[PDB]
Every structure is written in C-alpha cells, then in structure tokens.
Amino acid sequence: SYTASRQHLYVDKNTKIICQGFTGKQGTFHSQQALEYGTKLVGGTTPGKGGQTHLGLPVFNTVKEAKEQTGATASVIYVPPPFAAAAINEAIEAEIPLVVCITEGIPQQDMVRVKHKLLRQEKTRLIGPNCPGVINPGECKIGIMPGHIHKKGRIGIVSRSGTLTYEAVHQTTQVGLGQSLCVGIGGDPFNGTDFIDCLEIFLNDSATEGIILIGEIGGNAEENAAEFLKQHNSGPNSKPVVSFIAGLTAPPGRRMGHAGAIIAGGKGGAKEKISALQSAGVVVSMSPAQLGTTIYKEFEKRKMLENLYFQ
C-alpha cells in the first residue's frame, strides 16, 4: 500500500533532485540557492524547453526523461496552481520516489484526483502541496525554509505550517538540540503525507530522540496522531513529544489563511486538539515561542527519570 513509500521522506546526502518548473521565477531562485547550498540538484523540467541548460544543469521536457538521464530520486515542484496537479501526477507516473510540492493554491478537486492516483501506488511519496518542503540538516534540503537556522541534531519536526517550522527549528537550534529531519506537510486539506506518516519515521529513527508536532485548527489529523502516540509511544524507550497547536484565538467558521485551517460544524477547535494530545502524553507548549525550551526541559526530565529508576 501507499504506506510502503514512507521511508522516502528521509532524504539524505545521496538524494538526487530535479526541479519541476526549473526555469520559472521561484524554480530558478530556489534552484540557485540549492546549488549554492551544495544540494544534489541535477536538472529540471519545463515542457517545451527540453535540451536547454539552466544553472549549468540540463532541462528536460518530461519527468520520465529527467529521471532516466540523471538518476534523480526526488522532485520539487514550483509549478503554478493551474498545472501543478498534473505535475504531481507526472512525477507519480514516472515513479519518482519522493515528490515535494511547494505550490500554494491547487484546487481541492485537483488534489482529490491526485490523491486517488497516489493511494493506489507505492513507488512515489508526496509531501504537500502548499508546504515548505523537507530538510535533513547538512545532508539534503528540498524546499523554501530559510538558511542559517538549522543544526543537525536529535529532534524530528512535523508541521502543518511552514513559518512555524522555522520558529521550531530556530528554537531547537538555540537550545542546542538541533533537528534530525524536518517535514512540512503543508496547509492544504488534501495532501500526500500526514502526521502519523512522519511519526512512524521519527519513532523508528535512532538519530531522532524527541519530536515536535506542530498543528493548527481544522480536520482531525492531530487527534488521530494523538491516539497513535498514546498507543505506540507510551512504553519504556518512548520518545518525548512536544506540540503546539495554532489557532486558540481563531474565530469559528473562517479559513485562517490555510485552506485547511477552519473550525467548521463545531469541529476543528484548537482546545480539543490540545486536550487529546495531552491525554495521549504529549507535552503541549501553550506558547509558540517555548517549543525549544519545553522539549529541552523534557529531555532533562527523561535524563533524571532514567537515572533515578532505570539504571
């Protein structure tokens, strides 16, 4: 099933990337930045421009050609909303192991169609759309997150918000813990990777020693992940999980920027998510500024408990 592609989320120094929308405005700028950052970007696609060279790299008409000629195992999509779903579909058809879609504004009906194809295969893992991307600090960066804030370390971060990811990265770098792998699953209601997907990778990753889960109003993915953590991250050797849920002050029945961020039919409130996570044993930072300090304190408490009772 599609769950078999979860491991593709864990990009590393060996991941080779192509850019879909290579010659566009953001495709060009962020491809330049990836090259200047040392990430193994090896080419890209723009239909009708196959054969050109861009940033010293080959341009192809199709993902299939790009993959065959470069050995790329990941693609990043900077394609505008009207055509970005067909761009995801092309990368799925080409069996690209990881597809990261940055694009904001893809129609939900388009993504429902994309999801139908995605769930019926297992070669391709989709992150997004409307997401900042994924980073394994010092090994591989795919997306738009800012520079000079990450530090390779011990904390796995999964977030429905890109800007909140930057905050949590900055905070965990500043308290000296760093990040093992950071996945922004984006703010759209129909996407390729949920919280539980990332938690499974985090819980089974020896380099990840704690987890930050960043959520917000709308849907029930935080509730589902909480029950998942209650059942499967509650024994000995469990890993500390800290969470922040945006939208405590959001008015009901309004989309708070994100298509997915809405309290509808009395469902989706932040309080109910905080309470589910807490009752699952997740430590919830009430403040978005205190994610670094909260998980640092949780590590120190685990240290003391392990030395007190589990020598």
Partner: protein, 393 residues
Amino acid sequence: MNLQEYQSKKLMSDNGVRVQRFFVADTANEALEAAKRLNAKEIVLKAQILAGGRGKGVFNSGLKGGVHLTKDPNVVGQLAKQMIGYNLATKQTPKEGVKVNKVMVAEALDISRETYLAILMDRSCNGPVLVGSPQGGVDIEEVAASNPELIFKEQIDIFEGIKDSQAQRMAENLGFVGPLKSQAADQITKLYNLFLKIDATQVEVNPFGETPEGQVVCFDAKINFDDNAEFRQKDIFAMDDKSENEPIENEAAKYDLKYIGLDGNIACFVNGAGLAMATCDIIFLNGGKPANFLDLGGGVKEAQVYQAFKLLTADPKVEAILVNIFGGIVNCAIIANGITKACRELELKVPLVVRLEGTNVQEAQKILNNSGLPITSAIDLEDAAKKAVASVA
C-alpha cells in the same frame, strides 16, 4: 465568497436541479408584476440578504417579516415597497440590519417531509461524500449530536462519478419511496454533478423536500466554493456578494490579502498562516487582545505589504502594531520597504513592535533603521508579545 439566494438557486436550476420557480425584483412594481407572472396558487416573497432568520426579522420601515406568503400579487407589491431600500435586521445580523436591494418572488410550495442532503469534499475520506439525513430543517451538527445514526454517508469515487446505486440508496436512506425515490435519486445525481462543475467544497440542501403533489424540490441551499478554483470559476466569483462582510476584510480582498478582523486593540502583521494564528494566540496568552489576523502569503509583493500595513494604521481600534516576520520564501526587505512607505504618509501615533527573522533580515533591519521610525525591537516572539501588550497597558 457568498451568493444571494436568487444567485445560488438560478445556478442550481440552470444545472437541472429542481427549485421553486421564481423571479427577482428591484422595485415594488416589478415584484407586483413577477407575482402576476408566476400564476402560482400561493406566492412567497423573500428579502435577499445572506444572513439567516429572515422570516422573523424586522425592517426599519416598520414591516415585520422578511419572508411573507400570500395569494395576492397586490399584497406582494405592498409588502415589497416596505422591503426594498430598507434594512432588514434578524437574529443573525447586526442591530442595524442589512440593506435590501432585491426581493425574490417565488411559487410557494408546501413541503410534506423535510430531509437533509449535502455533497462535500471530505478531508477524512480523501474525496467527495454524500451526506444525508431524514431529519431535515435542523443544523446538521445538531443531528450529529442528537441522533448521529440518522446521518447516512456515501463515498463517491472522483473518477467513477456518482453511481446509480449510491444515489438510489441515499434516497432510500432519506425516506423517499416508490416514484419519489427515483426522482430524489435523479436530483442527488444532478446535485453531485453541479458540485463538481462549480468547484464547490460543499453543496448543502436543507430542506431537500417532497411536496404533497409528489415533487422532490430543493427548497433552500447553501454553497461553499473552493477559493483555489477562482481562476476557472470567474463567472461565479464575479457574483460574489460582499455587502455583509467586515469592511476591513473587504478592503484587504481588493489586494488579495488574507485579513480577518478580531475583537482587540493590538494589530498583527505576520507572514504565514501558522505564524499569524500563533501571533494572535501569544498576544492572548500574555494578557492582550489581538485586533486582527493577517497572513502575508509566499508571493506577497511590496505594494501589497504597503496596502496591508494601511489596513492597520487606518483602524481606529488599533492601539499598537506587532510586526512579526520569519521569512522563508518571503524576503524581509520587501516587508520593511512596504512598511516604511506606508508610514511615510502618517504621523505614527501607536507603538510599533517589530520582530524580523529569516531571509535577508540584515538588509530589512537596515531599512527600518534608516527610516527613523519609532520602533521597539524584540528578540523573540515571546518578547514581542509582552512588549506589545505592555505598550497598551
């Protein structure tokens, strides 16, 4: 976006969905004529505003009731003249009501039984699902709380489309028997196809009704549209009725800005939906009241930043401004440039707390420094919120 009743019902009626026959009137004389034109046994006259509770509402003309039934077109004319150009206040409007520019004149149809029927893009199910209940006329959330067993659902495969068996079983689930089952099943099919054609996130029919004469009719409906498909729904979005939105939100929409007015005095100026929500939240957590949510998106341009900052500076409720930016795809200098350009127009008379991080922060900081603006800096988001709250203590 929002559609008036006559706009959603035409859209449904033009796509084969059965609604009560109607005309739209701008004047009492047109309402008179429309009423004669219907040749209906009974006529229902309906003021066109978006807020609910029209039937029990009151006009500032003195007229009680925004929904009236009669058999007599003259009565339609007399009542319409008490409606058009006046303000209709209801339990869901502000005390001063909503100006009525149009009335619907429709055939009044009796309803034998009321059911609920909706189609929605359901995040839980990865696609469209039909949602139906024999308990019509009540908010669906209420049924779910009281009697969730009376909520029936069908998952519709996006590429197969709705199946006859699925429309038939939902019709049965809603209590349509014999000849009205096939009729309701056909209406469900047409509503589903409407839902797809218009990039709705929800088409909600309540009540989905059966008349004594054996007709299945959509008596009232509410449609939510996917903002992401405006580029392929230009005609529908051109019909957007903005006249009951909060004014500053209407101003922000002119510049493609995501602004939501709140009940506070500390304005927020943030990039990103998550960070903007959290900025409002951390103000509340430190004992303040945020004045607004504002989400500057990835592709924000300097002219939009400028217009956005002016939504705050021209708001008389705003007593302080908290700028908090963690730039990723957003370049911090674009923010600084738009802010300084907006402040060049006014004598800044409220505290301005500014926290900047991320892409090109050094250049943005220099731009703010060169402006000579009275800015109090913050080291982190907690520091910013505490200073913004204290600045209006």
